UniProtKB/Swiss-Prot annotation, chain A:
This is Spike protein S2'. The gene is S. Subunit of the fusion protein that is processed upon entry into the host cell. Mediates fusion of the virion and cellular membranes by functioning as a class I viral fusion protein. Contains a viral fusion peptide that is unmasked after S2 cleavage. This cleavage can occur at the cell membrane by host TMPRSS2 or during endocytosis by host CSTL. In either case, this triggers an extensive and irreversible conformational change that leads to fusion of the viral envelope with the cellular cytoplasmic membrane, releasing viral genomic RNA into the host cell cytoplasm. It comes from the Viruses. The chain holds residues 943 to 991 of 1273 of the full protein. Changing N27K: In strain: Omicron/BA.1, Omicron/BA.2, Omicron/BA.2.12.1, Omicron/BA.2.75, Omicron/BA.4, Omicron/BA.5, Omicron/BQ.1.1, Omicron/XBB.1.5, Omicron/EG.5.1. Residues 7-49 form a coiled coil.
Length: 49, 49
């Protein structure tokens, strides 16, 4: 518990990167989180929306 | 573009609308601007027999 500042900074950066990667896999109200499946299942208008 | 179709084919004549006849005969683009004027011709395009 002596190098707390550097460890905290590194942990914050790693947490931000991990949060971004996880948020990449969010639906955001869409049918699916992967675009290939959305293109396969839906017609061009609904898939585009 | 002037043509003659059946009753239910009117719906298929639309931008972004799926359909066998629309995909095989005449399809509107996704970014289509403009429109369709459809009128009944039961007294002109229909003959007995």
């Amino acid at each position: 518990s002596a190098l707390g500042k550097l460890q905290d900074v590194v942990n914050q950066n790693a947490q931000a990167l991990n949060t971004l990667v996880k948020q990449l896999s969010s639906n955001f109200g869409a049918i699916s989180s992967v675009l290939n499946d959305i293109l396969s299942r839906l017609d061009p208008p609904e898939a585009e929306v | 573009d002037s043509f003659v179709i059946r009753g239910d084919e009117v719906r298929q004549i639309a931008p972004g609308q799926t359909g066998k006849i629309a995909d095989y005969n005449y399809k509107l683009p996704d970014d289509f601007t403009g429109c369709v004027i459809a009128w009944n011709s039961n007294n002109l395009d229909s003959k007995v027999g």
